[PDB]
Amino acid sequence: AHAFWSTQPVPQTEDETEKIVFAGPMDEPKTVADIPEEPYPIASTFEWWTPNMEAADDIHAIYELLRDNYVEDDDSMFRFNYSEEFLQWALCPPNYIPDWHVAVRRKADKKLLAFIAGVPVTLRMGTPKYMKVKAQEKGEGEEAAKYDEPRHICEINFLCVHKQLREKRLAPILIKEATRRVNRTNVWQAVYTAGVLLPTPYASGQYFHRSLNPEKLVEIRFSGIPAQYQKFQNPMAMLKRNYQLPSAPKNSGLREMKPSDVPQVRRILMNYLDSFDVGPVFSDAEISHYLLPRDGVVFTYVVENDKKVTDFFSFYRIPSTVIGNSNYNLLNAAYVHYYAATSIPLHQLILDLLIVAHSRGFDVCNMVEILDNRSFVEQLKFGAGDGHLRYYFYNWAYPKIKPSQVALVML
Numbered sequence: 001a002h003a004f005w006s007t008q009p010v011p012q013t014e015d016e017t018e019k020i021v022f023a024g025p026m027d028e029p030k031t032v033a034d035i036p037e038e039p040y041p042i043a044s045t046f047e048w049w050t051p052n053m054e055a056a057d058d059i060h061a062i063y064e065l066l067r068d069n070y071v072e073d074d075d076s077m078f079r080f081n082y083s084e085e086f087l088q089w090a091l092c093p094p095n096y097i098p099d100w101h102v103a104v105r106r107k108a109d110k111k112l113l114a115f116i117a118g119v120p121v122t123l124r125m126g127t128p129k130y131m132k133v134k135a136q137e138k139g140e141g142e143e144a145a146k147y148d149e150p151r152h153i154c155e156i157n158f159l160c161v162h163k164q165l166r167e168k169r170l171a172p173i174l175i176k177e178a179t180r181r182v183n184r185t186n187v188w189q190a191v192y193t194a195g196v197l198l199p200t201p202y203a204s205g206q207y208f209h210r211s212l213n214p215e216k217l218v219e220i221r222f223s224g225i226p227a228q229y230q231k232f233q234n235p236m237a238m239l240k241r242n243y244q245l246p247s248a249p250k251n252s253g254l255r256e257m258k259p260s261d262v263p264q265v266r267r268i269l270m271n272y273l274d275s276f277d278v279g280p281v282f283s284d285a286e287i288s289h290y291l292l293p294r295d296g297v298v299f300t301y302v303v304e305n306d307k308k309v310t311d312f313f314s315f316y317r318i319p320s321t322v323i324g325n326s327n328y329n330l331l332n333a334a335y336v337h338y339y340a341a342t343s344i345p346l347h348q349l350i351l352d353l354l355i356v357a358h359s360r361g362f363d364v365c366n367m368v369e370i371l372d373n374r375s376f377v378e379q380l381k382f383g384a385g386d387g388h389l390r391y392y393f394y395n396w397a398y399p400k401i402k403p404s405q406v407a408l409v410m411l
Ligand SMILES: CCCCCCCCCCCCCC(=O)SCCNC(=O)CCNC(=O)[C@H](O)C(C)(C)COP(=O)(O)OP(=O)(O)OC[C@H]1O[C@@H](n2cnc3c(N)ncnc32)[C@H](O)[C@@H]1OP(=O)(O)O
Pocket: 001, 002, 003, 004, 005, 006, 069, 070, 071, 072, 154, 156, 157, 158, 159, 160, 161, 162, 165, 166, 167, 168, 169, 170, 171, 172, 175, 178, 179, 182, 183, 187, 188, 189, 190, 192, 193, 194, 195, 196, 198, 394, 395
């Protein structure tokens, strides 16, 4: 039973989602004028607050709420610690809508109690290729193509209720208020992800992890040791050697992305992402925002030869707090972001990502098996983890797809 989710315009079971053949809306059509003008009611001791996520002190308040109360692993050993600069980056892309950043404060002392954030995304989310084939067989091409045009929707992230307020049904109220604010701007779909199972994913992908500092990852119990390593005199020296990386990039012509690369990077990325069923469409402004290097936040390198950008990769940083180990404060993770290879094998491109990350002090490189990430797992010594990232839409029927048909990277 889902007392809140059963009231919302999402498919309600796996069986229902298995039956979906075409993309399109779930809810009755509505207009802006049908949506309440006034914020959703909340208890008198609380208030809605729209932080200013370019104002250092408002970003710091959200930063502390998430530092202390956002996602943990299942054994409460790690908690994300998104930085203030990452939150400004992630929450304020070009043409962001300040009103889609929604917080609850205690009215008395203005203590931040809860948050949810929406940002605009232009997403291709029409009927997937395998379903378009079926539709053709059956003379239903028109229906299947109806919602092919990329749509200006909301991407939700950073839903967080303070630990002391858990299981009080506040998260439904935050969801309904963000829904309201987004529908008042004439947007009626959202995309979101979660590491938990909710009604009802259109795709799910396992996490994968590439050890860059194995001694630390073992110390903090992120990683362990294959029992096979016991057959050795010295399990840990073997482990270090197994994961060792070059000290410098191997692709000649690799260098950091610069602003003048934006149009070439836009072209090679958009050519590559068009091959997947679900994927974002980025303007030059959005390429600049999401890909130009920002210290401590996003790292992006291009391969340039004959003065042409022919490949690139990016990764972003999320440290996690190491909750139980006295000797390390943080686990410094690099996450595979967007990339495109046209001149070299993808494994050869992504090897230099691992090199760069290691050289910069990262402990592990994480990814979900979206894009073509499965194509370099074994050669680059990524291992599958225990996490699974599920992809969802709000108000959008969508057939089940493999995660290798998803090109949207979630921050
Ligand atoms: C058109 C525009 C649409 C805009 C909106 C689009 C939809 C966006 C949807 C949000 C996308 C977020 C994407 C991310 O940010 S995923 C990251 C989620 N955040 C965390 O995991 C941080 C740690 N945990 C918390 O802060 C709290 O435990 C949260 C806030 C998660 C729940 O708080 P609490 O534990 O205090 O519970 P409650 O009594 O208030 O509420 C219980 C209800 O909440 C449902 N629940 C639990 N977890 C999630 C979850 N991850 N997404 C959606 N629903 C969730 C649960 O099934 C139940 O409903 P029902 O089972 O009774 O029916």
